[PDB]
């Protein structure tokens, strides 16, 4: 089964050590609600080797598998640290308070691979320019495992 796709932009300003992630939209999200659709929001976790650092989240959209956000989030990551971090993006279905029901997950950073690594590398090769890219969502537990694999 397909979990969905997410589009976000990445921008790095090396002088200021400012990392900006804009959650743009998601599409083809898995239906999570019985009979219904999903109520998606997106968490953005800045991590280091799968260890928590800073956490942010989007607003919640109701009853949609194709949410449009255009919500920006910024993180302070000094130049010397930018190849040590992981930007972890999780789409969840809001259902009840305090309960996390993940639809799918992906991360970018130096220890990511494939199209995730490409997005990260394109960001670094284009300082100060926001680079937008689509990503296929994966199962949370599979992404969590990969966060622990260092290059
Ligand atoms: Na990957």
């Amino acid at each position: 089964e397909k979990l969905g796709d997410i589009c976000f932009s990445l921008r790095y300003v090396p002088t200021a050590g400012k990392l900006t992630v804009v959650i743009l939209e998601a599409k083809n999200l898995k239906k999570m609600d019985v009979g219904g659709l999903s109520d998606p929001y997106v968490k953005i976790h800045l991590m280091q080797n799968g260890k928590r650092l800073k956490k942010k989240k989007t607003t919640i959209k109701k009853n949609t598998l194709n949410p449009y956000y255009n919500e920006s989030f910024s993180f302070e990551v000094p130049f010397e640290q930018i190849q040590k971090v992981q930007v972890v993006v999780t789409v969840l279905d809001y259902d009840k308070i305090g309960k996390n029901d993940a639809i799918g997950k992906v991360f970018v950073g130096y220890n990511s691979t494939g199209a995730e690594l490409r997005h990260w590398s394109d960001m670094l090769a284009n300082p100060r320019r926001p680079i937008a890219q689509w990503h296929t969502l994966q199962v949370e537990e599979e992404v969590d495992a990969m966060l622990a694999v260092k290059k």
Side-chain angles (χ1 to χ4, degrees), residues 17-34:
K18 184 180 182 178
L19 173 64
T20 303
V21 183
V22 182
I23 301 303
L24 296 164
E25 59 180 291
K27 64 178 174 182
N28 307 314
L29 293 178
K30 175 177 171 177
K31 297 181 190 173
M32 302 288 290
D33 299 340
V34 177

Side-chain angles (χ1 to χ4, degrees), residues 8-65:
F8 56 84
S9 69
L10 297 170
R11 182 186 184 247
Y12 189 57
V13 181
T15 299
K18 184 180 182 178
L19 173 64
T20 303
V21 183
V22 182
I23 301 303
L24 296 164
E25 59 180 291
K27 64 178 174 182
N28 307 314
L29 293 178
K30 175 177 171 177
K31 297 181 190 173
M32 302 288 290
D33 299 340
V34 177
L37 294 193
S38 296
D39 305 314
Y41 66 105
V42 184
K43 291 183 185 185
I44 313 92
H45 279 92
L46 183 70
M47 307 190 91
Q48 181 175 8
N49 304 320
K51 299 164 211 251
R52 185 168 299 186
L53 290 174
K54 183 84 172 186
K55 178 173 119 188
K56 293 185 178 294
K57 66 185 72 145
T58 68
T59 63
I60 302 166
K61 306 295 178 176
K62 289 205 180 183
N63 193 57
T64 181
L65 307 179

Side-chain angles (χ1 to χ4, degrees), residues 92-110:
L92 302 101
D93 169 56
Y94 188 84
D95 179 42
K96 301 290 184 179
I97 305 163
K99 180 180 176 182
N100 294 319
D101 267 39
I103 297 176
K105 198 168 184 165
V106 67
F107 87 98
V108 294
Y110 186 71

Side-chain angles (χ1 to χ4, degrees), residues 112-116:
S112 70
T113 66
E116 284 57 67

